[PDB]
Write a protein that binds this ligand. Structure first.
Ligand code: COA
Lengths: 848, 852
């Protein structure tokens, strides 16, 4: 009531294009403060040459954010960057942004400077109205709320250095209280305007060396720095990834102080800390590490650390580890808190505290550094376990402290079926975007949570993310396609194929998959009282198992049902359905006419009734002749049985006549079963005995829907009493009547996606010829493929490639969240279309 | 679940130097939008000539706020003005700011613009570091928190037009939750930089006519305006004044909208409203009036009002009254919400809704205006009763709504309490500041709550408010002084006087005062078993009552105790204490040595033991001779008895010798007059006769001798022996010693420090004369009662006033029965009578300080 977690993060920091580059610099002891001329000539107005600066301000994937180019060029680069970082942070947490649209999710952005607004409003003659909508401080929050459709609070707040952590704290209370299910929290700072650094210099706040020497005797001021950081908070119930749980957080203010408004009151800071620990059941003994503000100033460092000594150290046996991210990258003013937060969370996730720079000699006014009660993290130390504190104190006296509980959940042990292959989808703005996400999958193909999260974020509108891809994890090579999509809503068609598609040990492969095996085990309950188990048949090693015509009819249709069950579980419902032979039983299941039990028995009795009449030897053959031209040339006894295409027709009749009429047909160069002759007169013998058996199984005939196109009954009689329902009468009719397949294939619309639901994809050949050029035709199993699970997965991948959304996670047992600690970061692999590049204000745009 | 009230308010609005001028303009239908050149040449860059502007930005009482002049000149005028308005708002609510120092009181300021910061940071070569501390947006909140010592949150927030009402809403939740006992909420906007108006113009947001034609068909944009407003919220338990109770408030945000980020979503606004009424037990039927955002834009007016129609009108039988303060003064952007709030609260307080301007033809896209379900307040209508809604919606989509319950408490009946005089104090920055507050008191002298509040806020540090004053209400003429104070902490001395101070029906007057009467009735219980009641003695008509030496001793000391009890109840604890004669008994009470019972019996037995010995006729006389010169010239049997001053000494002895030594002393031209003593010779050998009989009686009354403190200076025992066994405690032994030993009074009066305040605690102020001569020139000497004054209550009050005049804080409210708060509705505003020292004028950025 209610637990609040840090779910996702991203950022741009000095010399750090994303949080991965940031971690690299932290743990590697790189100093991200630089002295180049990026923002203004170094030395200008006597300023320090050193400051923390972002690599680039010019990039922004404008069309993704609905920004036309004339506006993009007049947005605060703070905002352009924050839009990307905010998206990065939401998907970092395994969360599809669509899941939060329309919700009362809040946005709080800590921000102290609107230097671009100043620049872009300097000339009345030429300025643009829309510059306000891209630059005014309120918009730093409001444009986020607008893009993401977050209808909770949308506030830009300024408390100077504490602004971003105060934003965290405000968001935290909104979630704890119930106001908000989640919150996007931002911190931003840019160094565009030199006059600002001069004001700070003249106040005595900036060190000339341009260095935050956190805790050192040598410390003589702070280094100004840039940062764009965002973090997603959610209530625990919505989280996938969880970096940490926020145990507590508050703010107070120094109030009145004899020494002046910018003198930090260590006593009041201490007061804030004290109010948040022991009074809330949280012991200072529980802390492992505290991230101090640590700007490295003569006055403020001792105030702060001595305050820590009195509020926390005094109630502890063990030394308290202390650090400050500012030693590494300088001080990004209002973004300081979230910048530091990312250091803490990256440190926790990697198991190692990233060390401070510039700590050579403890400040002698700070007893606890000299007696070892505080221990500066000055080389990488391993994370021993414990809660974490964060200070962020602004120069006007606004103080904030937050207490974190790191997530320590470990990966599950691999089970019997983590050995399986998995499927990974991706969407993206560019080819590289998709390539990178897929590569990350390949590199962490065993991290079930990581893959589960990547799959959740892949289902996106095709307008927004026009590139898709898939790869199959857990198999020999790089099995991968990636391609651009066009935004046609591509309609989905199921084709259930007939006999001929059986084979030796089919579905031995897919029985490994728990989801498939369950649809087989449910088909077992339909045929247990009749002394047969489909599960045994599929798992059988016996060469001859499927020779028996009941073993074949039941196994063929039980596999079609399992394939339909999987396809359903991943979110595919068909726009149209078409059968061939025995496939019309499976179509009935796909249409909601037959239950599972009904359809499996309609295959058993269809097979049992034919086996028991020990009929004469018959034969069929596909032949290269049209429909009307088969009736012409067919010897007596042989009839055209299935209208596959304009060129292919399958004929049916007695073995004698058919084997002869085929050898005489090859001798004129023309294209040319179980010893049975389906869809001929031969089965009118079965008609009455079947009708009776299947009247006992299909008691309550349910209507066929518009989506299912019949192949047992021509278009002409679609309206009839027979065609209304999937009755026992409908089924018998299918057996004797011809299969009018090419008849239905005319109806398939442009750009459709056609799925051949069968244990072997026999009709691939026919469907290409029968269906429009645009349409893509996708098999699901192939006969004697080394591994059909791989095959199935690879072809689901091809469906995702079309623009239809597919979520593979339902194929495998669901992952238990929160994700384990150490689950790889997602934010750094979200890549944008930066073909771009956009205007950025420059020093000469401001007064001198 | 803690009730949150709006306790106090102040502001500067267009053409309106305070909320009274603002109310005058509202109810009078004055248009505060003007077209002069104050900020920039009107018309510049094609801008509207019209905007709402403050009369002045140049004033600020810098030293009061601890701002040195070099910094004052480089502060955002927003902040300078906000500091004054914030102070004004706290004291408006009857609340002394000192009562909130050190507390977790929060500060939230809605603010969208830092145009002064831009100006003051334009030249690197010459700019000041201090400019940041006076101009950066965070400081608009942080400097308030610094000055007032408010240690809760200190946040400057920007949601464009909704910022100040969002600040109200955030503060509201902090108080409701327990985070904060109170909160200062500000809203600020200035029009310094023309380029900003150009940006707004180019976005299509500003009407050319420079007018918010709220709800009119004609409406084509908004008028930009300035405003500095602040409001104090508290939890109910801390409030004195209560304008209204906040029943509910929330914010949401429009989110995603096809039409663009600055298109207002009436549907989402509706959603916000819906979430705050029926789900919280608040019925739309309960509203009387809703203050709409009402910027007067083609698109936004219908979105808003139709949203109101669907969220509220649809659940109402009666028409809903609607208005917008923006018709009156334009739109002050982030300060819009609190500006509108003051309209609502002023309207409520005066009993009349201030009408909109510029409403001629209803916007035809708004059905509810045409069918009468919404009724624009376009002429002044009386307030019939009901809850009030306020909308404030920012152009980036941040929406806020607050629901108010107006305060309707009425003044109690004057009833069976027949009207006493009261005392009214005031502090201020200038003479006028004090004169005005006192005048307001005089004009509302029967509003008990108003007076009680004015008294609470008068107690201030003397460094900060160097002028004080008082008046006595409820009496014949104008009893008033006002004067400047010096910042010496002036120490407070009590002088308990001796005999001679009795008189016929003394304290008949002060028995009206409940607190005094009770200290008499407690002195009655000490002497009921001995067949005497002091209350009867004071109320007695018998001319001779106080001739009897026990009637006098007990009544004199019982009144001294009651005066000490009053002085205590108004907050005065003495820095030093000094007795004379029988006064050393009362000193014991004032020092915490004697209980009330102990001290009243130590007067009874001191008097009864002298009455019993019917000793020889004796006499005393004050004489014009120094201490050592009396031992020289005194005939044997006469001794110098009391050392009153360097000039006056009272001699004591047998009637024979003293009457002769007085006629021989006038024949050498020396001052010499008899003292009326009951024919007795105090502080002579004559009382060694009483010594044993008293010591025994007083050992039965003072069972457990308690130590005298450093504060009490003895007059029965010289300085030299202050360390002794006798002087440790206020024992029976100490008391007997006083009777026989001389009274060493001028001895103690040397010790009284410079600039002290000396109170003669006696039923008549006999020693006034003596104390002036005995004590340093600086020191001020104040009586408390005077013999045969027409009315001693008036006198007492007038002299408490004179104590307040010195810089020592006195709170008269405890003398009278406590006022029940919240104050009644209509209690006069305080904010407009808080006047500052505006002698200095300060820099204000100008249009030329920005780019062109
Ligand atoms: C300082 C002092 C000289 C001033 O005396 P004062 O100004 O004449 O004061 P008084 O109380 O006498 O009052 C003034 C007038 O009212 C008269 N009066 C009215 N009511 C009176 C009353 N109840 N008792 C005595 N006199 C009274 C006086 O006779 C006097 O008359 P005058 O104006 O014609 O001279 C003198 O009060 C003094 O020294 N008192 C201290 C005596 C002392 O030390 N001990 C006494 C007992 S231990």
């Amino acid at each position: 009531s209610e637990e609040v977690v840090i779910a996702g993060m991203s950022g741009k920091l000095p010399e750090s294009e994303n949080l991965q580059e940031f971690w690299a610099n932290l743990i590697g002891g790189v100093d991200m403060v630089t002295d180049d001329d990026r923002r203004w000539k170094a030395g200008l107005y006597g300023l320090p040459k050193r400051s923390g600066k972002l690599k680039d301000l010019s990039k922004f994937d404008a069309s993704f954010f609905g920004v036309h180019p004339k506006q993009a060029h007049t947005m605060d680069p703070q905002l352009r960057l924050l839009l990307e970082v905010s998206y990065e942070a939401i998907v970092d947490g395994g969360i599809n942004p669509a899941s939060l649209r329309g919700t009362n999710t809040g946005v709080w952005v800590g921000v102290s400077g609107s230097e671009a607004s100043e620049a872009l409003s300097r000339d009345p003659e030429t300025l643009l109205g829309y510059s306000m909508v891209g630059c005014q401080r309120a918009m730093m929050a409001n444009r986020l709320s607008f893009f993401f459709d977050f209808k909770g609070p949308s506030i830009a707040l300024d408390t100077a250095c504490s602004s971003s952590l105060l934003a965290l704290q405000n968001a935290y209370q909104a979630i704890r209280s119930g106001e908000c299910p989640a919150a996007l929290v931002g911190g931003i700072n840019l160094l565009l305007k030199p006059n600002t650094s001069v004001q700070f210099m003249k106040l005595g706040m900036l060190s000339p060396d341009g260095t935050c020497r956190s805790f050192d005797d040598s410390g003589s001021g702070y280094c100004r720095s840039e940062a764009v950081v965002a973090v997603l908070l959610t209530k625990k119930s919505l989280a996938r990834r969880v970096y940490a749980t926020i145990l507590n957080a508050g703010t107070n203010t120094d109030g009145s102080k004899e020494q002046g408004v910018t003198f930090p009151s260590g006593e009041v800071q201490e007061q804030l800390i004290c109010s948040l620990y022991q009074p809330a059941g949280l012991a200072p003994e529980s802390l492992e590490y505290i991230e101090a503000h640590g700007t490295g100033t003569k006055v403020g460092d001792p105030q702060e650390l001595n305050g820590i000594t009195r509020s926390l150290c005094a109630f502890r046996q063990a030394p308290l580890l202390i650090g400050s991210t500012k030693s590494n990258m300088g001080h990004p003013e209002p973004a300081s808190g979230l910048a530091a937060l990312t250091k803490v969370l990256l440190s926790l996730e990697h198991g190692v505290w990233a060390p401070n720079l510039h700590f050579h000699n403890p400040n002698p006014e700070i007893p606890a550094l000299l007696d070892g009660r505080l221990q500066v993290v000055d080389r990488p130390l391993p994370v021993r376990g414990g809660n974490v504190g964060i200070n962020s104190f602004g120069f006007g006296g606004s103080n904030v402290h937050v207490i974190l509980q790191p997530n320590t959940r470990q990966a599950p042990a691999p089970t019997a079926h983590a050995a399986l292959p998995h499927l990974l989808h991706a969407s993206g703005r560019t080819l590289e975007a998709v390539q990178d996400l897929l590569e990350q999958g390949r590199q962490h193909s065993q991290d079930l949570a990581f893959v589960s999260m990547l799959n959740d974020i892949a289902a996106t509108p095709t307008a927004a993310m026009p590139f898709r891809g898939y790869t199959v994890l857990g198999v020999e090579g790089r099995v991968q396609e990636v391609q651009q999509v066009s935004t046609n809503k591509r309609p989905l068609w199921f084709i259930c194929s007939g006999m001929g598609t059986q084979w030796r040990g089919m579905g031995l492969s897919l029985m490994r998959l728990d989801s498939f095996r369950e649809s087989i085990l449910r088909s077992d309950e339909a045929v247990k009282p009749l002394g047969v188990k489909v599960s045994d048949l599929l798992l059988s090693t016996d060469e001859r198992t499927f020779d028996d015509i009941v073993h074949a009819f039941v196994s063929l249709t039980a596999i079609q049902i399992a394939l339909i069950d999987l396809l359903t579980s991943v979110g595919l419902k068909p726009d149209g359905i078409i059968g061939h032979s025995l496939g019309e039983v499976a179509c009935g299941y796909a249409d909601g006419c037959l239950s599972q039990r009904e359809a499996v028995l309609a295959a058993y009795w269809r097979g049992q009734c034919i086996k028991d009449a020990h009929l004469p030897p018959g034969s069929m053959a596909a032949v290269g002749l049209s429909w009307e031209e088969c009736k012409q040339r067919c010897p007596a006894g042989v009839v055209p049985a299935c209208h596959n295409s304009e060129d292919t027709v399958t004929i049916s009749g007695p073995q004698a006549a058919v084997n002869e009429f085929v050898e005489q047909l090859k001798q004129e160069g023309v294209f040319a079963t179980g010893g049975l002759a389906f869809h001929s007169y031969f089965m009118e013998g079965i008609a009455p005995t079947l009708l009776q058996a299947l009247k006992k199984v299909i008691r309550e005939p349910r209507p066929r829907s518009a989506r299912w196109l019949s192949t047992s009954i021509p278009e002409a009689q679609w309206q009839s009493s027979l065609a209304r329902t999937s009755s026992a009468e409908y089924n018998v009719n299918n057996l004797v009547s011809p299969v009018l397949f090419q008849e239905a294939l005319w109806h398939i619309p442009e750009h459709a996606v056609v799925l051949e639901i069968a244990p072997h994809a026999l009709l691939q050949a026919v469907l290409k010829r029968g269906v429009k050029s645009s349409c893509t035709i996708i098999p699901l199993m192939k006969r004697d493929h080394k591994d059909n699970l791989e095959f199935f997965l690879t072809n689901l991948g091809k469906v995702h490639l079309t623009g239809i959304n597919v979520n593979p996670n339902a194929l495998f047992p669901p992952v238990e969240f929160p994700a384990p600690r150490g689950t790889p970061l997602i934010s750094p692999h979200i890549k944008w279309d930066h073909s771009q590049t956009w205007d950025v204000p420059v020093a000469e745009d401001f007064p001198n």
